[PDB]
Structure formats: structure tokens, C-alpha cells
Amino acid sequence: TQMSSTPEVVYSSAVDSKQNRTSDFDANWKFMLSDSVQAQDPAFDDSAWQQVDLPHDYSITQKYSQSNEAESAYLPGGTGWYRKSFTIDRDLAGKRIAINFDGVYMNATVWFNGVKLGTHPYGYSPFSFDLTGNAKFGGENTIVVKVENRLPSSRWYSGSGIYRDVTLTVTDGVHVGNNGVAIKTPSLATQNGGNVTMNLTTKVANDTKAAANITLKQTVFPKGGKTDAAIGTVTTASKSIAAGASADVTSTITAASPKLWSIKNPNLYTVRTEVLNGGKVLDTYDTEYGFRWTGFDATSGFSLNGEKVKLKGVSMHHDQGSLGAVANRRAIERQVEILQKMGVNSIRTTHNPAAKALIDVCNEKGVLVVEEVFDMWNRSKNGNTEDYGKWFGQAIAGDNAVLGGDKDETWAKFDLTSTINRDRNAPSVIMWSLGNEMMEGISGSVSGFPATSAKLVAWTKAADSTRPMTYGDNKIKANWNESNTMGDNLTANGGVVGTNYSDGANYDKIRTTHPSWAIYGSETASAINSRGIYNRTTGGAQSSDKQLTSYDNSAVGWGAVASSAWYDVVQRDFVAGTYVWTGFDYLGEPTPWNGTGSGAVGSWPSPKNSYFGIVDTAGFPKDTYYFYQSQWNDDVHTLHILPAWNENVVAKGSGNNVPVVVYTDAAKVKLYFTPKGSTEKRLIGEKSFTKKTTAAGYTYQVYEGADKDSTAHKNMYLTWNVPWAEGTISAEAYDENNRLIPEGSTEGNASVTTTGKAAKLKADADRKTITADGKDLSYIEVDVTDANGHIVPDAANRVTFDVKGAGKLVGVDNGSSPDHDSYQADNRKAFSGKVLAIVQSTKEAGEITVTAKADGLQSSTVKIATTAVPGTSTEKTVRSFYYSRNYYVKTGNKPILPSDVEVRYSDGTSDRQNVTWDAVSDDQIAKAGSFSVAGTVAGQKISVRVTMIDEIGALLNYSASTPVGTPAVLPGSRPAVLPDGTVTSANFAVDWTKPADTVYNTAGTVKVPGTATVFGKEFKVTATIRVQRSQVTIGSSVSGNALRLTQNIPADKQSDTLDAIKDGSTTVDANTGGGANPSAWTNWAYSKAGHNTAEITFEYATEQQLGQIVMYFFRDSNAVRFPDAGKTKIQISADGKNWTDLAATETIAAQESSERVKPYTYDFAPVGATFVKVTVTNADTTTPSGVVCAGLTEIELKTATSKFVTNTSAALSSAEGEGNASVTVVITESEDHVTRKTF
């Protein structure tokens, strides 16, 4: 008979010349998550695929799983397929067409109309493909992107897919190049106020079969204004450009007193370049520009446009919380807004190129961007074997037609040059950061690094002379040689040197040791706090309740608290600024509950997001935020109190005394307390700041009274000890002249109060009007208050959102790290009294009513209006058609097409109307191949794909591999094989008789039967899946990379040199004639004092994935003796506090490795350790000296990596497939469904 695909919503997508040069291409893509499918061919039946609008993250929608890794948010990646079908109007004949991706994470492969264009590994750099050569003009075309985010690939939540805008560029054959215009104003600093010299260079490509005679007409005018407001023009002399050649065309414009781009006044200009042949304009290319200049002085730091500025910076990862990696413009904009309110003036794009959207935002909003291109270089971090390290140094394939950067060297060059090409004209970008902690979390020699650095520096210099390059190095603090060489070379090429995690003392060491260097804190603080937690005042370690104090006393081992990292910076004019880790919490890296390896950390649900943020994933500030504001925002006055004032949440100690903290930019603060129901405020105390100002003119405040904190940095804020009592702690603020600061004008909580029980929801939306573009967002904060409207400190009431109208709920969040509730749910628990709902617009104007509801609490309701995009027609238009477009008919039978199809309109109305289908050739009916059929409805042309089948021999069998503990995902469908060799692109839905999930919890092969009914005839298919364990490979020692190596033994009773045990040598110096041994460590001293044991502890700044430990114990004649078997013990932790015994096997080697050195090898399954404490117990023997001792020359802590290997072969053995390949009866398919070899 015939079978038909189920009815899908068909959107008609069209590319004509009526469209703008570059057009949004985000809409109407089909997506499918599938490790197995092959969807490259335009014929493929994508009817059953999910329709999505880009940008889109396909990781964020999958479910959390302990088999994944903490760093990457316990969320999976895998293989995603995007397909989009569209007509190219025949008016585009002659024109050139290109597709542009701003980001695709990661390992993208692109086909156009079945032709494979190429690949792009890196997940954050932008890239392009030409479609011209392969386009079918006046016809149906199909672009296909295959995204393979094979984990592990990130130390943070990557997300997966096309997470950033796609566009189409249509141009004449003679056109300005990709990112073709480069603007320089070499003298602006000098010319400022007068006429400014602009030097343009423009790549003009002649992609025609004829030499071309071209002139450029360039015009600089204010962005958003008309050309007649230009402040400069030029028209070039004729340049002849040969056929299929291109040329760089230099021009100069004189700008009539351009308005400077500044932080306060981010004035932008447009620079339009027209390509002229004869009279006619062939191409017109705009680029956004700002007039601005920077300077770096090694003593007085940074300056913008002549004024001295302090870089008050945050590091920001790319994800947008509950929305995942999706680079939604408004999401991104909102982040910047919140940061600006904090007093931020700079963002470091840690550790990868930003979305253009961010750059765009920063350009208009006036924020300095340090755009970082890379994290790791040629060596991967944290055993993320699939991270860009894999690709950094690889050459580009000859057949790879990817575009955007230089293809003549490595991916590194391409990705770097591509990013610079995109952003070269952006006023906001002040520096190119070329790497981050390049030598952290890696293995093997680093001697190559300084050379790799220079290579990158050179490339950058050549790519963009106009901005200093930089990096963020965390071994400057360790005085590594490599780190020093690299900074000289930075300095030598006009770079600024970023030190990560330096204390004040170290900042000073650098200046003295490196006077040439201009330095900043490239990454600072890394303080770890949750929002609204007050019941303790300590942290920096794994808590029982999976949260951390909001007081600024909690930080990682390598970092420091906010007070500290700012204090160390503000005081030193020569430390140009700070880039705090981080501005906003990000998904992944849940330090102190971090995991570089597979498995849950603590009890599940484990924390899945960060604690570093000043602001949580939802955009709710933590308390520390108001500290930063107090220190950074000179356009507001901060006066903020913590903690919240309820019995159950405060931290009582020293007789009911609770540390009350105040953050403020005021000169004097009087703190009052009012007992409940009373109306009389009792003054608890009064404190005055000291307003110091540095030589360069940066002015800060410290408290220097008698009750000042002993540790200096804590005096950047005020702390009182109030006794706990129901009531209201308020504070009033006075300026330098002792004039009171008005009660209204303060920012932050001017008073905390004891609250009632949870009573009402108050819900407010950030914007009451948004654009009806399917893009814009409204952010709805919901607080849980008592009867009087006081936010309830510990409220965790599950709130349910009812979204009705011209919108839809796209996310819900609370910024709670261990909450695993779906982001894409209609409900979520409040956390510390707050919950967020994100609502997105539709493409039709209307109203959105959103209702926050919770059990036993007064509902709240907000109204949001969506306004239509200017120029959308009020008269109703055709939207889409609902019908089945795929028909498989038996040969000799006429195709039975439907008489009618459901039509949708802009109104959302649905009318079923009739279709007049084209005639089907008699030849075609018995032809036994595929063809398309046109019809017409409501003026528009619909199409249907028909494939004719004579007979089907069988359906191809399937084979895969799965990790033990993870059930195999079986294919939705299987392809058809003719009695003829030929394998069809026609797939038929299979129903599997699935075994229990438990079957996959042991190693072995597993057969699963499944059957599909094809033209009434049921066919029998076997899926033979192989369940496998990880393949673990042990690496080299990382003892060298230790952040710290301490000793149990007190200072006075230590003997020999400890640091010797990570020096990479195993032998003992015989050290005859006394003195401390430089080659080895011992406990001789402590032993003599009668101490039986000793504890050596390695600390790391990143969790190490250990796979083996080898201890090189030694012996002498007098005292030191090899320890007894099984007595030496190892332990591991994530914080330095909570320990765990390493389950290991000891092997004492047969022979000594070197005279009087024997290696004890400890074996164990891979485990993550940020700390490793070896407890050495002396032998139970007697010695000539009568003192028994233990001694070590080296402790090698070897790392390990795990892969899940899936085989590649189509060959046969015993029939059976060699690499568990699918046997079909013999055509075969490898375990990786890539190579099918028929024999």
C-alpha cells in the first residue's frame, strides 16, 4: 500500500534579495539528540524531530546523573543534530551566500545539501561556511549541523549545541570580506578634541570571473543617526582587483571632533563602506566603532581616554543560569546591568570568546571587556581529554572549508584570529587575554609553554596592533621560571601581565622582581558563599547542609575573601585592577564539592553549580555584593546590614552575641536596636571610617578605632556584636561633614527585622513591557514575605507559576547549588526566601499574565505586555501548515496525497483549506526512487517528498556500546536494505522488546529483539549492545604542581628538606659529615623526641584525578629504615578539613631503585583529591643509633584518565563483527555508526 510520516508543523523559510545583507537565521530548526542517527542527506525524515528556535542548549534539558562529573554540572552532552530546510529564491542567482555561527559547542560538522563543508572543534570561537557553490537556486535547500560534545570537555558547564545566533550573509560577487574593515586612530590621544585621523584597511574580495575596478566610499556618522550627520568621508582612487583575488584597500578619514566612547558616555559611531563599480554600489558594509584609547603605566596602572581608572572587574562564564548556555541578549544584558549597579566597570570573558551579544551590550552600556580566547593551550586540564587541549595544536584539514580566521597553522591561530576579526572594532574590548592558568591541572614538562606563549603573542600582535595582549597566570605567585620568561615576552610586545590569586605581599614581590611589568589581578578572591545563610560564620569547607555562610569568611584554599583581595588591590596604584571570581554563579565547578571524575560528591543530590558568584544564578545578590558596591559604586550610597534577624537563622555564641556586619560608603554609622512592639530605638554603638587616598588618587575607607579587627582587611567593613533579641536592627549613616544620609536614598537593607511566619508571595517583573520577537525576556522575582511584607529568611516554599498569554515560561531558579529540580518546570522551591521565573515573549503581540502560587500563601500576579516588532503587518498573514510531508509508496501504486491541509495565521487562527497537487509521472510511479511534489494553498507553495519502494530485503541490524550502569539508548528507527546491495535512506520505526535496566549493570554483550511493520510485513531486527567498563590509563607525577606541601612536625623538630620529595629525583645523597640532607626528607628529629609517626600533606589548587602513588623510601646505616609493610597510610580530601581513607594496595618492590632507596607503589581505582595526607609510621626495628627513623626522597602522585572506547571496524570474525559490529545477512556497521562496509 503506502505509509506516511505523522503530521508535523511545516514552516516555510525563504531567502530572497529583499532581505538585508546579514539576516537572522535562528528560526525553524529541527533538532534531535541521538548518538546513532545519520541525518546529513536532505532526504532524511525529520518529521518526528523537535522544532526549536536558536539559540538552543541541548545539555540543559537532559536529566542530572551521578555517572557524569561535578565540574560539568552532572549534566551530559553527546551528539546533537540540527537540520533546517529553506528555499533560496531565484533572484539570488549570481549572489554569494554564507552561513555564520557565533558559537557551537562543540566539534561541529556542517553539510549543505548533502555536501560536507567541514568541521569546527572549538566551542566558543565564531566561524562561517560558504554555501554559494552548493546552493540550489530557486529550490529547496537543507543545512545540517552535527554537534558532538563528547564529555569530558570543560571544567565548567559548557552546555551543548548551537547556543548563539546564526545568520546568513548574501552579497554581490564583489564584496567586502568577512569582518573586512579594520579601523585605527593611532594619534587619538594627541588629536583628541580636534580632527582625528582614522586609518581604514578593507578587504575587498573579487569573487567573479572578471577583473574588477573598484572604489570605496566610506562615511563615519553617529550610530542610529542618518548619513547626513557624518563627521568624515573619503572616496578611494580606483584599485583594480583581479578575478577570484582580493585586495586590502587602505583609506583615511578625518573625523571632525568625534565624541569619545567612555564608561560614563559610551558614544558609538557607524562606519559605512560602500564598494562601487562605475556608478553603482555593489556592496555596503557597516561596522560599529568608538573613539577611545587606553594606557598602562607600571606604577600608576590603567587609564581610559587620559583619565586614571581602576579596573573594578568580575570574571563571568557564559551560561545564563536556568537558561543554560543559551546566549539570550536580554539575559546577558540583565547580567551587565546588575554588575553595573554593583559598581563594576570591566568584565573578563573567562575563559573563552564572549557571545557577540555581550560585546554588543558592553559597547552600548559602556563596560570594559578583557576578551579571553583560551583556557588551556596544548595540554588538557583535569583529564578532560575532549577539551580544546586536544585540538589547540592540530593543523586544519585541506578539505575543511571552515572560515573566519587564518587556516595556515593550528586551530589556536584560527580561533584566535577569528575572535579578533569579529571584535577588532569594538570600543569595549581593551585587551586580548590569550590563556588562563595554562600550566594548572595538567601533566608533564612545561618547558614548552613560554615558546607557545610567544607564538600566541606574535599572532595577536599581527592580528591587532591596537590593543595589549595579556593572560592570567597562577604560577607567577609560585615564581616558576616559565611564568617569568612569559611575562617578559608579554611586556616586550606591549602586553599587560595578569597574575591570578596573588596576595598583597606577592604583588609587591612582582614589582620589585619585575619593574618592567604592568600588572593586574587577572583572577582574584574565589570566595565561596551561598545566599542568605547566617546560622554559622565559617566556611571554606564542605558543610553538612550543602551550603556556605553568607558572611565573608569563606574562601577556597588558593584564594581569599572579598575584603582581603580588594584591600590588597585598592592600596596599590601599580595593581591596575581586579577581576573577581566570579561576578555570577555558573553551572558546574561546585567547589568545595567539586569533581573532575565521574561520580556524585557527598550525598546526592550533590551541589551542581558554583558558590563563587557575588550574585547567584538567578541574579539575586549575595550579601558580599553590597560590600563591593560600598567599595566600587560612586554613583550610589550603600548601607547594608546582615544577618537577618530571626532566632533560627542567626549565629549565637559568646552568650547570645551575634556578629552584625555593615557594608557602607558612608563616613560614620550609628547602629540602633528597637525591641519588638516597642517604638524606641536604642543606640548600640557608633563607628567612623578613615578616608585614605593613594598617590594616584584612588580613595578607600578603613576602620581604625580601638575595637578594630586584628586582621586589617576586615576593617574595610564594620562589625558589632549585638545580643539576640526579637526586634529591628536599623542603622543610620552620616557623610564626612556629619550631615545625615537621607533615609530613602540608601542601597541595600538599612534594617533587618524579626519576621512572622510565611504568609504572602510578592512577585515583581523586571520589565512590564517586552518585545514580541520570540526572544525578549521578562524576569519575575518572587519573595516569600510575612504578613507585613518582610522577606522570610529561611523560607523554602515551593512556588508554582501559571503563565497565560502571549508568552511562555522558559525557566525557574533559586541559585541553590544542590537543588536538582528541573529548570524547565512550572514550579521550584524558594531558597532563602526567593525564587525566580523567566518568561519569554512570542512572535505575536499580546499580554502575559503570570501567577505565583504556593500552599497556604497569598498568591501574586504580574502583567507583561508584548509589543510587536516595528513593521510587522497588522493584517493577518500565513504562519505555518500542519500536514505530513513524507510519503513512502509501493511501486506501481499512485501516491495518495491529502486533499486538505491545516493552515495557521498570525492571529493564531487555524483554517483547513484545500491543496491542488501537481501531476505525478507514470514513469515516476514504477521508478522505485525518491522525488518531490508541489501543491498550492492560500497562495503559498507546499511540497511533499515521495519515495517509491519495489521490495525490501530486510532492515539493517544495530550495534552499540554503553558504559556499565548506563542503559543503551536504542534507535527510534532502522534503515531498509533492498534485495539489491543498496541501503536506503528510508528508516522504519522499530518497537523493541526491552530487557530490564538492571541487565546493563554488568559487563558483557546484551541482545535486544525488535520488530517493525513495513507495508504490512513485519521485519525482525536484533540490537547487540556491548556493556563495557572505563579504560583507565595512569599518567605521570604531579607532585611538582603542588600548591603547598606541609608537615605534621613542629618547626623546631623538623629534620632534612621536605620540598625534596616533589623535586622529581628519587636518589639519596649520602650526606656524610652531617648537616640537613638536601635530597630527602626524614623525621629523625621528631623520632628522637620519641614520636612514632609524621604526616606530610600535599595541597592542590585544582582537584587531581590520582591513579597511583609511588613512595621512594630510603635507609641509612645509623637510623633511617624502610617502613614495615602495610603500615604506611594515605588519605584524601576536597577541603583541608574532612578526610577519607584511600582504599589502596601496597607493593614493596623486589630490588632497590637506587642505592638504599626502595619504591613502595600504592594502587587504587581513580579518585579525585585536592589534598593528599600521607601518614608515615616508623619501622618496628632497632638501629645502631638506637633511634628508628623513616625517610623519603620522593612521593610521586600520578594522575589517571578514563575513556570509554567504542570500536571502529566493519570486518568479520567467527558470522560475527570483529569490533562488535552489526552483522546483517553480509553488510556490516562498526560500533561507532560511521563506517558500513558491504561484502
Ligand SMILES: [Ca+2]
Ligand atoms: Ca626528590
